Swiss-Prot record, chain B:
Component of the RNA polymerase I (Pol I) complex consisting of 14 subunits: RPA135, RPA190, RPC40, RPA14, RPB5, RPO26, RPA43, RPB8, RPA12, RPB10, RPC19, RPC10, RPA49 and RPA34. The complex is composed of a horseshoe-shaped core containing ten subunits (RPA135, RPA190, RPB5, RPO26, RPB8, RPB10, RPC10, RPA12, RPC19 and RPC40) where RPA135 and RPA190 form the DNA-binding cleft. Outside of the core, RPA14 and RPA43 form the stalk that mediates interactions with transcription initiation factors and newly synthesized RNA. The lineage of its organism: Eukaryota, Fungi, Dikarya, Ascomycota, Saccharomycotina. DNA-dependent RNA polymerases catalyze the transcription of DNA into RNA using the four ribonucleoside triphosphates as substrates. Component of RNA polymerase I (Pol I) which synthesizes ribosomal RNA precursors. Besides, RNA polymerase I has intrinsic RNA cleavage activity. RPA190 and RPA135 both contribute to the polymerase catalytic activity and together form the Pol I active center. In addition, subunit RPA12 contributes a catalytic zinc ribbon that is required for RNA cleavage by Pol I. Residues 160-172 are annotated as: Bridging helix. This is DNA-directed RNA polymerase I subunit RPA190. The modification Phosphoserine is found at residue 57. Belongs to the RNA polymerase beta' chain family. The chain holds residues 833 to 1028 of 1664 of the full protein.
UniProtKB/Swiss-Prot annotation, chain D:
Component of the RNA polymerase I (Pol I) complex consisting of 14 subunits: RPA135, RPA190, RPC40, RPA14, RPB5, RPO26, RPA43, RPB8, RPA12, RPB10, RPC19, RPC10, RPA49 and RPA34. The complex is composed of a horseshoe-shaped core containing ten subunits (RPA135, RPA190, RPB5, RPO26, RPB8, RPB10, RPC10, RPA12, RPC19 and RPC40) where RPA135 and RPA190 form the DNA-binding cleft. Outside of the core, RPA14 and RPA43 form the stalk that mediates interactions with transcription initiation factors and newly synthesized RNA. This is DNA-directed RNA polymerase I subunit RPA135. DNA-dependent RNA polymerases catalyze the transcription of DNA into RNA using the four ribonucleoside triphosphates as substrates. Component of RNA polymerase I (Pol I) which synthesizes ribosomal RNA precursors. Besides, RNA polymerase I has intrinsic RNA cleavage activity. RPA190 and RPA135 both contribute to the polymerase catalytic activity and together form the Pol I active center. In addition, subunit RPA12 contributes a catalytic zinc ribbon that is required for RNA cleavage by Pol I. It is found in: Nucleus, Nucleolus. It comes from Saccharomyces cerevisiae (strain ATCC 204508 / S288c). The chain holds residues 173 to 401 of 1203 of the full protein.
From Swiss-Prot, chain E:
It is found in: Nucleus, Nucleolus. It comes from Saccharomyces cerevisiae (strain ATCC 204508 / S288c). This is DNA-directed RNA polymerase I subunit RPA135. Component of the RNA polymerase I (Pol I) complex consisting of 14 subunits: RPA135, RPA190, RPC40, RPA14, RPB5, RPO26, RPA43, RPB8, RPA12, RPB10, RPC19, RPC10, RPA49 and RPA34. The complex is composed of a horseshoe-shaped core containing ten subunits (RPA135, RPA190, RPB5, RPO26, RPB8, RPB10, RPC10, RPA12, RPC19 and RPC40) where RPA135 and RPA190 form the DNA-binding cleft. Outside of the core, RPA14 and RPA43 form the stalk that mediates interactions with transcription initiation factors and newly synthesized RNA. Three distinct zinc-containing RNA polymerases are found in eukaryotic nuclei: polymerase I for the ribosomal RNA precursor, polymerase II for the mRNA precursor, and polymerase III for 5S and tRNA genes. Belongs to the RNA polymerase beta chain family. The chain holds residues 12 to 111 of 1203 of the full protein. It comes from the Eukaryota. The modification Phosphoserine is found at residue 70.
UniProtKB/Swiss-Prot annotation, chain I:
It comes from Saccharomyces cerevisiae (strain ATCC 204508 / S288c). This is DNA-directed RNA polymerase I subunit RPA34. The modification Phosphoserine is found at residue 34. DNA-dependent RNA polymerases catalyze the transcription of DNA into RNA using the four ribonucleoside triphosphates as substrates. Component of RNA polymerase I (Pol I) which synthesizes ribosomal RNA precursors. Besides, RNA polymerase I has intrinsic RNA cleavage activity. The heterodimer formed by RPA34 and RPA49 stimulates transcript elongation by Pol I. Component of the RNA polymerase I (Pol I) complex consisting of 14 subunits: RPA135, RPA190, RPC40, RPA14, RPB5, RPO26, RPA43, RPB8, RPA12, RPB10, RPC19, RPC10, RPA49 and RPA34. The complex is composed of a horseshoe-shaped core containing ten subunits (RPA135, RPA190, RPB5, RPO26, RPB8, RPB10, RPC10, RPA12, RPC19 and RPC40) where RPA135 and RPA190 form the DNA-binding cleft. Outside of the core, RPA14 and RPA43 form the stalk that mediates interactions with transcription initiation factors and newly synthesized RNA. Belongs to the eukaryotic RPA34 RNA polymerase subunit family. It is found in: Nucleus, Nucleolus. The chain holds residues 23 to 156 of 233 of the full protein. It comes from the Eukaryota. Present with 3360 molecules/cell in log phase SD medium.
């Protein structure tokens, strides 16, 4: 490319190199939004899958000729809750908890995790365990005795 | 804690060329071929180039230790069930480790066969600014030993160089203990107040 | 006496002011009186060049003359110990070189099973 | 001190007395030794903890710790700016001060600006990374301080703003305050009688610094037992 | 022989401590970072460190408030006081002594 | 006002130093045995600010500690890495040296002076002494001066050349450390003795030279055209206490670092002046015995003057069933006939 | 590989000193060279006096034990090099307008 | 401190032989082991009490609080 | 202006027989230190390359050559005057710099390696 | 997961099960269709030659070979033009006037101002001084 920028007279000398170094690292030629870098991993369980380092369900539906759009699985539970109801926001949690205790090979039983995931998803929203999550409760000494 | 003398002959001639296993890992990384000698004036310049990068010369670790742990295959797979001076049901060092009493076959092999590579945090021995890993080495050294491969075993004792690398595998391991002491202290009492 | 993009003096020894913002065909110093009432060097240009190693990508990774990154097969480990596997029976099983707990605890110098992806901890 | 082991029993101590400690009200105490940066060697640190200080402040810089000959510690940090204007840094009592470098370079020895310029310009004209970064450092100061031409006049301004935070006495002129700043802070390896030689090191802590922001000098790691004493 | 054990020089030393030479010199070299560092405060050219430390702080001066009361000149109005200088030129720790 | 500094540890200053923390400058030299008390004088702390940074770069064992900081002898727990000690032969310069003779020798070599030259850049070699730039040469010039000043030093030429002087020649390298030839002779450096191979004398090398030298270990392992220096013993790199471990290369190194941690907190002999002293607590072992499996540097430090422990006929045996998980079973008639008795 | 030498000469006639490159002062003046005397290498003066500048200088004082520059002359029938030797002025350039020091007080 | 009366493991009375090695090297004038052999030296389950003992009671007795000087 | 005393002005001066014609007279930039006696040597090896390694009085002498700026300042008749003999300032030509090096004796590798 | 109500996870993912008909490159083309394409990825050099007349700035670029970026990131040479004509200049013409305004307001800060301190954090400027010296037994 080639373009000859002209500037004024009362303007003093400026570095020009560093600004092109900053802006060329900022331009996006072709970005599908909220998605950076898809990658094809080692094939696991025979499942030919992909891994996407970003969460955007709405644009991946528009890629149906290469993606089976009825098997897509993430870890952003607050994005599955917005799109795929709350019952899929529950089955993701028992996966994402079990994706931590499996890598260290600690087989916690699913009966413990189904109880936790059905406690967070009792109000239809992804309630955490914190001060804000306890704010809906009935027994009020339990609120005082937390912090 | 003693073999017969044949396991040294089982390792030595290929442990002698284990410097040309590190070198043959130092040729696959630099994308040279033809098994160039280590003091080539262009091989050093590529190795000087893969020393100032972090991700490059992370591959140089992962190619080398993948290749030079295959020597530990060729030593553990032939010595320890068979080359030992006392066979198993009287061999009290294996009678504990091969029953679940205490210890396992790493601790069998680090006493009888060899230690192996003392890789720090997955990569390898760190490097100075020059290209030495110790002041006992030629800089930019293409070797198993300066990569930290420890040929000796704890029965015959470890040399002053590879003793120092094994202390690197201690001091970075013990500091995980002083960094986790209250990770899941709040988290379990965060559940039993809500699942109360 | 101009070197690069800097106009100077013959008397005082200062950077003279840039010949664009000045008046018609004249520049001068501030300590002494620089004799350039002609603006002999009223025409100036300089080359710059960027740092070409400030744009890293995966394409420069192929434009380099050494192995910048792995390929999908370039990691073939060989730390074979002849230990029994329960989940896939792969006797081959690598190690990893660490020592986790405080020194009232054995060798935490791990394993990793090599056929089914099972992870193993060398506790004691 | 010059006392026999036979005579240490005569005055009731162990025959192999260690010594080298204090007795503070019976509790035997000692000053712990500490690891600090090597004296008189300009390190080439990179540090993300410079970006807190404001906008346009880079992450690079040159750190020196010039000790005095009576063992007094003094750090003269030398930052780098995206703007090109390199800002010197020091500490006097409890605070942090920033000055443009050419203000010191004019003040150390009696330089004209081309004597400053060609002082830095030793060779390597053809490097476009020396000969362009160096311009804004000179172009800005002529624009920022046009009324500070020679060394007697730049000390009128430097000892002016740093007068009362140094608590100098009213018999001392603004230059004599500023000379005392140049003899108490900047590069105290010599102090006086080295105001020519203190110039030649700030020509070295810039040409190092410009050889860092391009990356021809890899940054020193202070932990690595080679820059610490 | 390769080396030697000791059981009679130890008893030549317990009963008879040495007169003119402090035995086991690697121990007196093992604390030479601390002994020699407190020696260098006094021992050193130009009086040592503390006698060099005090000639780097020597002028804390102030002025009075009386005019000099000469003729009504330029130097009798715009004048504050006379020059007075506190200074330290030499410091020394004596030795531990003891007196009522 | 000065004793208050030595009581609490507070570094009070209405002016302010150049350091960054104002606490922990002084400790209690305990006397719980003789190993613990000698290791206070040999300890050095990295710095009280770096406990904040949990990035382990300030805490990691580093290769430039070869012969200066002991790889073993440091405690476990929270200051594990911040509290590493010196070596068996790491001697520290206290006074400075003389520099009124050395610039007259560099100008006698191929060094042009600082003022006459008007040159700079990484492409030349800046010669410095103690932070005073004096010269400019080529890279193959100072490559010889770093051998030429070494011959002129270890031999008897001029008393102006000291032997504590470190010659930190930095060889040029592609995008590495800044090249230059750096001399330091001042106070407060770390120095250890090595054996310089031509003109074979005892030589002194800092931690800034040693980044660019090839110091061999045993003279079995001296190669050609690489080693200028060898070490007198490979046990010139350990601490005092870590050296005293018997057969200290056969163990697994987290049981050497653990040994210096449980070697200090025993009960041995705090001293023999215990009649004319007064301490808060004095753990004294009654029947002190020298080891039979000992070190050769056990005697030169004179640890027979403070025998820490005793020799016990050990049966490595599993016989009773009251001994697992590191438990041990004493002999009663050893104890009733006196065995590690102590007040 | 030989070039002869005419003679040896010391006496004060010519100074040989370094400056900043690009300096054409008006050459319609003579300079002064004055001589402190101590029977070794003497402190020598720059004295540049024209109608627009009045500056001065000095010669160095530290490394005078391994250095005395030289002006030599050649002749293509004799082919030697002579000596007009000089300790080096390392000096500077100012003008008579660069003496305006201002008020150092407030009143 | 002083020599133990009884061998710890075995039990033989070992307050007996502490005194013959100056005269083994001044009156008998030998080397070590020849002087470490003859005079009733028998079992290296208790031969240690020759080699191992330190006898630190000599270093205490110079600190007498009951005599002038 | 001679602010301290002992400054003496120069009265009689030697002759400076430069022509600088239009045969041809060249004013070079030969250089000399003082660590050797001046009027001692009349044999002087020097060239254009680094073929200049010399030894007088048992020292590792050499000429250091580096071509990649200073002044001539002559008298006219008898006052020192610092007149710049020139064409219109002066330019320097050749680097004849008398130098001294120093070299180690040879490395005796063969001794200390005990088998 | 358990706590803190993760609306913006620092490290998210998404697994995409591809079909059965698709081959490897027909998915390895497809990774190159989705992922972001920085303009920093396709550029080897930027030559800028400065001149004046009246300040003028020539800006040149050097991309890579066309059989590389179009086969690594699936970008044509007119998709490159469609960025430089539309995204690259307005970001660049912003960051010239944006940086010229620093030249036109105040030509430097005032020397004499003491900022807050240097090696001190804004949370008590220290870690601790009473417990970080204990061994593992202590």
């Amino acid at each position: 490319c080639e373009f000859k920028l002209e500037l004024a007279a009362d303007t003093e000398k400026l570095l020009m190199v560093n600004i092109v170094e900053e802006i060329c690292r900022k331009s996006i030629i072709r970005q599908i939004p909220h998605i950076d870098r898809c990658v094809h991993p080692e094939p696991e369980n025979g499942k030919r899958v992909l891994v996407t380092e970003g969460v955007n369900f709405q644009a991946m539906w528009d890629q149906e000729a290469f993606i089976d759009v009825d098997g897509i699985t993430s870890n952003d539970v607050a994005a599955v809750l917005k799109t795929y109801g709350v019952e899929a926001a529950r089955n993701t949690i028992v996966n994402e908890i079990n994706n931590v205790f499996s890598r260290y090979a600690i087989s916690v039983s699913f009966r413990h995790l189904d109880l936790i995931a059905d406690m967070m998803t009792r109000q239809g929203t992804y309630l955490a365990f914190n001060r804000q999550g306890m704010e809906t409760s009935t027994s009020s000494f339990m609120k005082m005795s937390y912090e | 804690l003693r073999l017969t003398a044949e396991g040294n002959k089982w390792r030595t001639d290929i442990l002698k060329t284990s410097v040309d296993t590190g070198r043959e890992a130092a040729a696959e990384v630099t994308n040279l071929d033809k098994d160039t000698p280590a003091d080539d004036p262009e091989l050093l310049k590529r190795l000087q180039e893969i020393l100032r990068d972090n991700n490059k010369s992370g591959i140089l670790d992962a190619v080398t230790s993948s290749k030079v742990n295959a020597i530990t295959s060729q030593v553990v797979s032939k010595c320890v069930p068979d080359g030992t001076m006392k066979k198993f049901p009287c061999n009290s060092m294996q009678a504990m480790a091969l029953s679940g009493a205490k210890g396992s076959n790493v601790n069998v092999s680090q006493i009888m066969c060899l230690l192996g590579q003392q890789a720090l945090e997955g990569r390898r021995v760190p490097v100075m600014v020059s290209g030495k890993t110790l002041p006992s080495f030629k800089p930019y050294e293409t070797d198993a030993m300066a990569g930290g491969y420890v040929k000796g075993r704890f029965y015959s004792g470890i040399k002053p160089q590879e003793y120092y690398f094994h202390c690197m595998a201690g001091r970075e391991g013990l500091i995980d203990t002083a960094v986790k002491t209250s990770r899941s202290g709040y988290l379990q009492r965060c559940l039993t107040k809500q699942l109360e | 006496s101009v070197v690069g993009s800097l106009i100077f003096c013959l008397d005082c020894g200062d950077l003279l002011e840039n010949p664009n913002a000045v008046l018609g065909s004249n520049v001068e110093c501030s300590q002494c009186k620089a004799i350039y009432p002609k603006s002999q060097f009223s025409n100036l240009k300089v080359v710059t060049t960027t740092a070409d190693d400030a744009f890293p990508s995966s394409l420069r990774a192929k434009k380099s003359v050494v192995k910048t990154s792995l390929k999908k097969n370039e990691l073939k480990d060989g730390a074979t110990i002849k230990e029994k596997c329960p989940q896939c029976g792969n006797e081959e099983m690598n190690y990893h070189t660490l020592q986790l707990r405080s020194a009232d605890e054995g060798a935490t110098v791990f394993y990793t099973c090599t056929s089914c992806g099972y992870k193993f901890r060398t506790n004691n | 001190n010059k006392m026999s082991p036979y005579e240490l029993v005569q005055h009731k101590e162990e025959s192999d007395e260690i010594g080298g400690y204090f007795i503070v009200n019976g509790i035997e105490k000692l000053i712990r030794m500490l690891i600090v940066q090597r004296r008189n060697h300009p390190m080439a640190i990179i540090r993300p903890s410079f970006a807190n200080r404001g906008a346009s402040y880079s992450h690079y810089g040159i750190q020196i710790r010039s000790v005095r000959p009576d063992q007094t510690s003094q750090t003269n940090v030398l930052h780098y700016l995206n703007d090109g204007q390199v800002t010197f840094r020091f500490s006097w009592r409890k605070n942090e001060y920033l000055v443009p470098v050419v203000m010191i370079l004019k003040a150390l020895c009696h330089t004209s600006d081309r004597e400053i310029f060609d002082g830095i310009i030793g060779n390597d004209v053809k490097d476009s990374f020396l000969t362009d970064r160096l311009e804004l450092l000179l172009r800005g100061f002529k624009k920022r301080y046009p009324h500070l031409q020679n060394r007697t006049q730049v000390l009128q301004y430097l000892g002016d703003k740093f007068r009362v935070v140094f608590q100098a006495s009213p018999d001392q002129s603004d230059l004599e305050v500023g000379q005392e700043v140049l003899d108490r802070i900047v590069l105290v390896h010599l102090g006086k009688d080295g105001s020519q030689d203190k110039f030649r090191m700030l020509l070295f802590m810039i040409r190092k610094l410009y050889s860092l922001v391009a990356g021809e000098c890899s940054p020193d790691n202070p932990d690595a037992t080679q820059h610490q004493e | 022989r390769t080396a030697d054990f000791r059981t009679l020089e130890r008893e030549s030393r317990f009963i008879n401590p040495p007169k003119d030479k402090s035995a086991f010199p690697l121990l007196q070299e093992a604390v030479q970072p601390h002994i020699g560092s407190f020696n260098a405060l006094t021992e050193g050219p130009d009086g040592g460190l503390l006698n060099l430390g005090v000639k780097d702080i020597g002028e804390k001066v102030i002025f009075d408030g009386k005019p000099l009361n000469s003729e009504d000149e330029i130097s009798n109005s715009g004048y504050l006081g006379n020059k007075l200088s506190v200074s330290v030129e030499q410091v020394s720790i004596a030795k531990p002594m003891s007196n009522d | 006002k000065m004793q208050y500094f030595l009581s609490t540890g507070n570094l009070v200053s209405q002016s302010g130093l150049d350091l960054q923390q104002v606490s922990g400058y002084t400790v209690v030299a305990e006397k719980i045995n003789f190993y613990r008390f000698i290791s206070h004088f040999r300890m050095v702390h990295r710095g009280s600010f770096f406990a904040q940074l949990k990035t382990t770069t300030v805490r990691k064992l580093l290769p430039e500690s070869w012969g200066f900081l002991c790889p073993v002898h440091t405690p476990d727990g929270s200051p594990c890495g911040l509290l590493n000690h010196f070596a068996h032969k790491c001697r520290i310069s206290t006074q400075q040296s003389d520099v009124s003779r050395i610039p007259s020798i560099l100008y006698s070599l191929g060094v042009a002076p600082a003022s006459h030259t008007f040159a700079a850049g990484p492409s030349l070699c800046c010669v410095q002494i103690d932070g005073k730039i004096i010269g400019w040469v080529s890279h193959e010039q100072g490559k010889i001066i770093a051998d030429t000043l070494r011959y002129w030093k270890v031999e008897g030429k001029t008393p102006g050349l000291p032997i504590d002087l470190e010659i930190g020649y930095v060889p040029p390298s592609t995008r590495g450390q800044y090249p230059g030839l750096y001399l330091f002779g001042g106070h407060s450096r770390m120095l250890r003795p090595v054996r310089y191979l031509p003109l074979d004398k005892e030589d002194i090398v800092g931690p800034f030279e040693q980044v660019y030298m090839n110091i061999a270990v045993t003279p079995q392992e001296i190669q050609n055209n690489v080693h200028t220096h060898v070490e007198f013993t490979p046990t010139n790199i350990l601490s005092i206490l870590a050296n005293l471990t018997p057969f200290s290369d056969f163990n697994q190194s987290p049981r050497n670092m653990y040994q210096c941690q449980m070697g200090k907190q025993t009960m041995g002999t705090p001293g023999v002046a215990l009649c004319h002293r007064s301490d808060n607590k004095l753990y004294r072992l009654q029947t002190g015995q020298t080891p039979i499996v000992k070190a050769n540097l056990y005697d030169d430090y004179g640890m027979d003057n403070f025998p820490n422990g005793f020799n016990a006929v050990v049966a490595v045996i599993s016989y009773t069933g009251y001994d697992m998980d590191d438990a041990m079973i004493i002999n009663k008639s050893a104890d009733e006939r006196g065995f590690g008795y102590g007040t | 590989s030989e070039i002869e030498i005419e003679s040896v000469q010391d006496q004060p006639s010519v100074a040989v000193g370094s400056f900043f490159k690009g300096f054409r002062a008006p050459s319609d003046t003579t300079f002064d060279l004055y001589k402190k005397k101590k029977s070794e290498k003497d402190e020598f003066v720059l004295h540049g006096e024209n109608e627009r500048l009045e500056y001065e200088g000095y010669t160095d004082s530290s490394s005078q034990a391994s250095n005395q520059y030289v002006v030599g002359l050649f002749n293509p029938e004799k082919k030697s090099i002579q000596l007009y030797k000089a300790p080096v002025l390392v000096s500077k350039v100012v003008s008579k307008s660069s003496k305006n020091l201002r008020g150092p007080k407030i009143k | 401190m002083i020599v133990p009366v009884r061998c710890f493991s075995c039990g033989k009375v070992v307050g007996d032989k502490w005194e013959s090695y100056l005269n083994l090297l001044q009156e008998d004038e030998l080397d070590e082991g020849t002087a470490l052999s003859r005079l009733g030296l028998k079992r290296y389950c208790c031969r240690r009490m020759i080699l191992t003992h330190v006898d630190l009671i000599e270093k205490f007795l110079r600190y007498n609080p009951l005599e002038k000087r | 202006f001679s602010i301290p005393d002992g400054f003496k002005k120069c009265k009689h001066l030697k002759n400076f027989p430069l022509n600088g014609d239009n045969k041809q007279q060249q004013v070079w930039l030969i250089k000399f230190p003082s660590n050797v006696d001046i009027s001692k040597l009349k044999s002087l090896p020097v060239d254009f390359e680094s073929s200049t390694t010399m030894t007088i009085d048992k020292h590792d002498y050499k000429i250091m050559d580096d071509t990649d700026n200073m002044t001539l300042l002559v008298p006219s008749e008898s006052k020192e005057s610092l007149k710049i003999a020139s064409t219109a300032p002066l330019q320097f030509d050749k680097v004849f710099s008398v130098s001294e090096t120093a070299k180690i004796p040879a490395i005796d590798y063969s001794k200390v390696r005990v088998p | 997961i358990v706590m803190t109500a993760s609306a913006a996870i620092k490290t998210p993912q998404m697994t995409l099960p591809i079909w059965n008909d698709v081959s490897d490159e027909q998915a390895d083309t497809f990774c190159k269709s989705i992922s972001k394409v920085l303009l920093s990825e396709v550029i080897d050099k930027v030559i800028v030659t400065e001149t004046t007349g009246a300040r003028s700035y020539v800006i040149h670029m050097r991309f890579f070979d066309n059989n590389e970026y179009s086969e690594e990131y699936d970008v044509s040479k007119e998709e490159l033009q469609n960025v430089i004509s539309n995204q690259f200049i307005h970001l660049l013409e912003a960051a010239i006037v944006k940086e010229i305004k620093k030249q036109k307001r105040t030509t430097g800060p005032d020397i004499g101002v003491a900022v807050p301190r240097l090696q001190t954090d804004v949370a008590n400027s220290s870690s601790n001084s009473k417990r970080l010296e204990e061994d593992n037994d202590e």
